[PDB]
């Protein structure tokens, strides 16, 4: 019996990234190159497609827990600011880089916000999100 | 026939004596009752200085106040309860009564 | 104290010593080779990525801070 939960959830996004690259209907926005992703990071992303990774991480936080992740996506993707005075508080994520993403993942059909807020997923996309996991499982020993 | 009677107070033993009074007279008058459900207690914290002035080694007092809360649900009519919430009530105790 | 002027890329012959003698060391790590060859620590990682698929170094561990390459096969 195979699912996402026996796959050592680190390269599951290193093949779900390449699958949302290869299919390539994600509506990358216009301003991709020139953002900080936070108010605590200091540089741009090193990887040239930093948008697909975050779409795969979101698509698994969404597979795992919840139909109510909107600002809890910024509560899960913040970090550590550095004010030059004292260790700073866990700073929030970015509102636009995730509102634009979930509106861009509404372009295909895997997400569906219904009630009690937030975006939840569909069994039809759960088919795809579950079949490549047994692929990685048998292909990694 | 859905009536909840909340007993909240500071005095633990006298609040226990009223919640067991208000259950033993229900049980001795034949109406089904739930248990004496105990909610967790809340505390207060005040930390001040033990000095009017600023002189002396820096020493601080402290102050607390605990509070408890119980609630009891019944299955009864809503007229004899004015008598029931009157038999040996004790000072300090703040009884709430909800019929809705 | 001395200053260190290392090399970014091989001039002509320090590569001609690396392809002659590095594959005959028992301890091939980038902080040992760089003490021998006078090279920067951002180059030894590219040299042992070449000899990985060139197949002469017998990779052992791969922790991000330290790699361990032994000798080759006995014979």
């Amino acid at each position: 019996g195979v699912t996402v939960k026996d796959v050592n959830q680190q390269e599951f996004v290193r093949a779900l990234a390449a699958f949302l690259k290869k299919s390539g209907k994600l509506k990358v926005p216009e301003w991709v190159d020139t953002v900080k992703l936070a108010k605590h990071k200091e540089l741009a992303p090193y990887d040239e497609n930093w948008f697909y990774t975050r779409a795969a991480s979101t698509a698994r936080h969404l597979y795992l827990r919840g139909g109510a992740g909107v600002g809890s996506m910024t509560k899960i993707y913040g970090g550590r600011q550095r004010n030059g005075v004292m260790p700073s508080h866990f700073s929030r994520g970015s509102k636009s880089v995730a509102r634009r993403v979930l509106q861009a993942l509404e372009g295909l059909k895997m997400v569906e916000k219904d009630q009690d807020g937030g975006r939840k997923l569909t069994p039809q996309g759960q088919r795809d999100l579950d079949r490549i996991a047994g692929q990685v499982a048998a292909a990694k020993k | 026939h859905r009536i909840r009677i909340t007993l909240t107070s500071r005095n633990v033993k006298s609040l226990e004596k009223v919640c067991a009074d208000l259950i033993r007279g229900a049980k001795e008058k034949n109406l089904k009752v739930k248990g004496p459900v105990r909610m967790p207690t809340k505390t207060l914290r005040i930390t001040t200085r033990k000095t009017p002035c600023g002189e002396g080694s820096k020493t601080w007092d402290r102050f607390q106040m605990r509070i408890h809360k119980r609630l009891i649900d019944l299955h009864s009519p809503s007229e004899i309860v004015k008598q029931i919430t009157s038999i040996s009530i004790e000072p300090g105790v703040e009884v709430e009564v909800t019929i809705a | 104290r001395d200053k260190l002027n290392n090399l970014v890329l091989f001039d002509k012959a320090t590569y001609d010593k690396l392809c002659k003698e590095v594959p005959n060391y028992k301890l091939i790590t980038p902080a040992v080779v760089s003490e021998r060859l006078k090279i920067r620590g951002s180059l030894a990682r590219a040299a042992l990525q070449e000899l990985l698929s060139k197949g002469l170094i017998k990779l052992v561990s791969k922790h991000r801070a330290q790699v361990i390459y032994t000798r080759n096969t006995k014979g």
């Binding site: 540089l43 | - | 890329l9 590219a46 040299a47």
Partner: protein, 144 residues
């Protein structure tokens, strides 16, 4: 291919400024006064160039382009929220200030603030404290 090809300089005379020829290009530009770490990766991004190369593997007819981008960072779509000269007082245009202009306009702006006998700026003539700090203990880097 880990050996030195031709054309591999060690000092790139760029903009009356000597650029090292061994650092990564994302940290080779910062010798220009004004442009630092963030704006460099963008200039080395709007042209589809690798930034995992050394200063000397990039051709001489190709660094006329990253340079033209850094001189004119408008026609190549850089937004209005990067420029360290937004809404100038004298003309009122948006642009970038490079290695010369960043000291030039800076010491013409402090002369402008100085001439009017203004307390914000009549403190550089004294050489003392303004951004709103107290002193009482915090200089003492000499000072008689």
């Amino acid at each position: 291919s880990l050996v030195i090809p031709e054309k591999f300089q060690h000092i790139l005379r760029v903009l009356n400024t000597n650029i090292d020829g061994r650092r990564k290009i994302a940290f080779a530009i910062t010798a220009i006064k004004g442009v630092g770490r963030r704006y460099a990766h963008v200039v080395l991004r709007k042209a589809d160039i690798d930034l995992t190369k050394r200063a000397g593997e990039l051709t001489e007819d190709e660094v006329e382009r990253v340079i033209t981008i850094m001189q004119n960072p408008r026609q190549y779509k850089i937004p209005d929220w990067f420029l360290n000269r937004q809404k100038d007082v004298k003309d009122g245009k948006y642009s970038q200030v490079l290695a010369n202009g960043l000291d030039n306009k800076l010491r013409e702006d402090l002369e402008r603030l100085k001439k009017i006998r203004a307390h914000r700026g009549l403190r550089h003539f004294w050489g003392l404290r303004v951004r709103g700090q107290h002193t009482k203990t915090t200089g003492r880097r000499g000072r008689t």
